[PDB]
Amino acid sequence: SQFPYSSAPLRSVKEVQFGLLSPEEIRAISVVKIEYPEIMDESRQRPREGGLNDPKLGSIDRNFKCQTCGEGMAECPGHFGHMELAKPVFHIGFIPKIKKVCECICMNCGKLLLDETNPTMAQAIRIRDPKKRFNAVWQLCKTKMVCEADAPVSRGGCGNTQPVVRKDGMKLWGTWKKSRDAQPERKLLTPGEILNVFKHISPEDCFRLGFNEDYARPEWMIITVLPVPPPQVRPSIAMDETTQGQDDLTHKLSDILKANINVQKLEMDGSPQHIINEVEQLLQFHVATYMDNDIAGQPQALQKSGRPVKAIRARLKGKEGRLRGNLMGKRVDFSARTVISGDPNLELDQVGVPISIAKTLSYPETVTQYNIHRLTEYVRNGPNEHPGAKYVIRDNGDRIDLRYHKRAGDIVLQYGWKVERHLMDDDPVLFNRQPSLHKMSMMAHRVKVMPYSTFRLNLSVTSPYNADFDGDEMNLHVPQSEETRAELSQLCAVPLQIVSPQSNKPVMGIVQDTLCGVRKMTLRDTFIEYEQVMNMLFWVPSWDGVVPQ
């Protein structure tokens, strides 16, 4: 309900289909063509149209709306642009696979070196998994070193000898045994040659090789048009009050576009092959390092400060990468952290919460006819008096802040509204200590608001948490819904976790001076007078009011 209304139906993802992007699709989904290396028009606001900061790509400024969708910064997802490459270049992530495919097929007729006549080849084709199918087909066709123009009847081959391909950085060398020993020639396999060879692969051969005709076509592994991500992917940062800093991806895209312009200019004017080779190799290097800057066997691309460029591949790997650092585990709202202390006078499933933390955190309670009076009282009390409230949320989703409202007493609550009231007693909250070695390290307690600034625990629960009070800190997470509150109170509650499934024995017991005192108190020669017995009996909450003889 926090999102503006959209008439499109709301559904959930059921399948993720992977594949490569065809140049046709890249051109189709694009909204603008990027050609001018200058980021800024004239350093007078209004970034140059057709440049790397075109307003059609999306908006990252509060007062500027996207020129493509018309939505604000909070709603615009960003729109892609495309950059046409003067000469096709290798995709750095697919070079070994490109080499394998070149080994599997003939470089002239564009057909497989083996056919279903071979029983082993038919057996390999019979398998289902594309990766294992390709592995088997490569293991077979690797040995076959000559194309056959005749059946081993014409099989469709051209009879040419198949070259042997070797990898060297981003370049592939193909060595032909041209016609005992003679002079063989090894010549460079340019990306364009491989591309126009791959375009002639039949769909049946493509399927036999493990590629998919609809989604992953082999010639799409060579980049001919580059997609330019929106500024949302590469946001700029204001280093100081005046000068903002371009992102690493923006600088790399500027370098790539400059190289493209250089190649285009050189091609039309005059063509010394040495210069063409140098400039095209520079373009290949820039495109490769834009997506992977840890290519072993060659120096990395460096910034002007000397630090290596943060390629897109580096964004996704490691503890701090996308998957581990932002998707599997992320920072969350509605949480608190402070030092823990012990309280002998707390029930097992109770946690003592400071007043300031109780005021800061909140729980949105729906206004009904069972609690409208109490919620109106909370709204009147305001965000500084306990019990109180912080916000009132209407049905449409608008939030009314009670700090900046001059007419808080002039607010009437309608059924279905939400009041973000303060944290109160007996609210279930999840409580956690790191490292979370087992599932008893996260348990749900009941809130009890107390003075002073430390979380307070019954000392029996210090065993499952592996916690003591010499400076440890623990995390508290507040559920924000009725469903989540029910889950916490019915599944993770402390009483339900007393017996562990690891060794079918309790994880909580009497500990420390309570254990010492129950040993001392139950000795055979410990006798208690009447007046002390009365006090000791009154202390038991469950005592039934009958004193034993």
Partner: protein, 174 residues
């Protein structure tokens, strides 16, 4: 908003020329293809409706709903007023006016005979349902006129077009 029983239709690479709507070429698109599926997934044919059949069905359904809403206890204006929604009321009023002012067959038995003639005929066993609906709707009088109005019937020269037209004119109430 409303979704057809036909789903999927994911991305491919081939592009076909039988995708654009065209009445003359009898290319009605995927959602109006000759083969359809019901709620049980069984085979189903495209169901066209002539103005006579459409008028009969709409009148029957509207009067059934009007009778049901009154506890099971004829005027087109009242029948339109039965429905809910001002825009819906206007739309049904316009459709009823069109059907009434161009109703070739206002009788159930005349429409039944016309449908029997246009379906059970040996020549009409190949006729597309859209062609049948157009023939029963436009009320053409001549073979040349029908062919000009309906280009599809030009390629179907195995049809007793003139005598069928005369039969329709006879069945048409003067």
């Amino acid at each position: 908003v409303s979704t057809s029983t036909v789903g999927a239709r994911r991305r491919r690479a081939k592009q076909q020329v039988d995708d654009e709507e065209n009445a003359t070429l009898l290319r009605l698109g995927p959602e109006f293809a000759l083969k359809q599926y019901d709620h049980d997934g069984n085979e189903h044919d495209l169901i066209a409706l002539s103005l006579s059949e459409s008028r009969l069905l709409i009148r029957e359904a509207l009067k059934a709903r009007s009778r049901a809403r009154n506890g099971g206890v004829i005027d087109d204006d009242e029948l339109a007023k039965v429905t809910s929604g001002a825009v819906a009321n206007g739309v049904v009023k316009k459709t009823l006016d069109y059907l009434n002012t161009f109703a070739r067959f206002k009788d159930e038995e005349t429409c039944t005979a016309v449908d029997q003639l246009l379906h059970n005929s040996s020549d009409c066993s190949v006729l597309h349902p859209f062609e049948i609906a157009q023939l029963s709707s436009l009320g053409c009088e001549d073979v040349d006129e029908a062919i000009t109005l309906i280009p599809s019937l030009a390629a179907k020269k195995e049809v007793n077009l003139q005598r069928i037209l005369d039969e329709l004119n006879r069945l048409e109430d003067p």
